[PDB]
Design a protein around this ligand. Structure first.
Ligand code: NI
Length: 341
């Protein structure tokens, strides 16, 4: 059974609700982004209207085989009428094709559903500037002040400089980057660009990347691993065993691996500055965990909500424990008393 925080009152709509069978009264299912916790349940047999971005629709058709007749892609930043209700899709600053959804209810209520997002001051000049929001359905993934991490631009600066130094010292070093979903593509694209290389990967991963509308993609990626000195592998293989195994397959071309594991937040963020980060090393293999987040930090979240001044907040993450729910409600009341709304 579909939980309440995935239903949109006064409409036939649900958000990210595909794992519950047929939802009673649902005339249109919205999908905010192509991540498995959110699409859980969709397949080629799905027969109801799905509303999403163009990029998410490309992935539904090619990776999950959903039939074309049930995919309804909408442009961003554009007022659209769906089943007699005005909606707008906005860029969520999460993974490629991820959106927030503005719903203008027939009774005059305005609701914002963030999906998953990384809040940014640029959002304060989207179509959100214009008007009041009565209800915010909020991505609360890192809603506590201990969750700190650097900007994505600082993290990429660190990765490019680390890779370029290593390979200039040793031209026979291979660079490997881990992946398990869409998102974080800048990590491996920025490294391959500084090294003058295409990125090499499996046929399955190449197919996924070909759905993303990235400009000049055919100039940046390949399935010919022998032509590339930046390889992608599943995240599960980014360990000394899996990396040793990979290096054997490379035909004596390389004598060293430098690997990157993009993570979200980890507890070493509570102590160690990005500049000071060091790898784990075994012999000729080194592995860097880098904190490249596609979710809001606590401070980014707080800024966005204090700017928006919503009348009511419904969290969509960390909702399963009483202790989590109580902590989140305390910070929402602080924010409101501090800013005066
Ligand atoms: Ni996500």
């Amino acid at each position: 059974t579909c939980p309440f925080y995935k239903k949109i009152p006064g409409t036939g709509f649900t958000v990210d609700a595909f794992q519950y069978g047929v939802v009673e009264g649902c005339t249109a299912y919205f999908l905010t982004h192509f991540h498995s916790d959110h699409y859980a349940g969709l397949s080629k047999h799905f027969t109801f209207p799905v509303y999403c971005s163009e990029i998410t629709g490309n992935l539904l058709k090619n990776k999950l085989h959903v039939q074309e007749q049930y995919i309804h892609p909408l442009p961003l930043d554009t007022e659209c009428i769906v089943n007699g209700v005005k909606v707008v899709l906005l860029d969520a600053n999460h993974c490629p094709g991820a959106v927030m959804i503005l719903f203008y209810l027939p009774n005059g209520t305005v609701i914002l559903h963030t999906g998953d997002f990384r809040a940014d001051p640029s959002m304060e000049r989207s179509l959100l500037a214009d008007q009041k929001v009565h209800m915010l359905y909020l991505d609360t993934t890192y809603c506590s002040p201990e969750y700190t991490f650097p900007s994505q631009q600082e993290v990429i600066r660190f990765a490019i400089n680390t890779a370029f130094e290593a390979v200039t010292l040793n031209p026979h070093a291979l660079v490997v980057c881990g992946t398990y979903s869409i998102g974080k593509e800048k990590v491996f694209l920025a490294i391959a660009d500084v090294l003058g290389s295409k990125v090499g990967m499996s046929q399955e991963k190449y197919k996924t990347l070909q759905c993303l509308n990235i400009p000049e993609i055919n100039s940046l990626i390949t399935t010919d691993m022998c032509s590339s000195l930046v390889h992608l592998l599943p995240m599960m293989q980014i360990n000394f065993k899996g990396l040793q195994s990979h290096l054997k397959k490379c035909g004596g071309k390389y004598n060293q691996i430098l690997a990157f594991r993009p993570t979200g937040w980890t507890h070493s963020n509570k102590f160690t500055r990005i500049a000071d980060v060091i790898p784990q090393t075994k012999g000729n293999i080194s592995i860097y965990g880098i904190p490249y987040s596609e979710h809001s930090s606590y401070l980014e979240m707080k800024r966005f909500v204090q700017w928006l001044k919503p009348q009511k907040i419904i969290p969509t993450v960390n909702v399963g424990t009483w202790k989590s729910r109580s902590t989140m409600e305390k910070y929402f009341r602080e924010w409101k008393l501090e800013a005066g709304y």
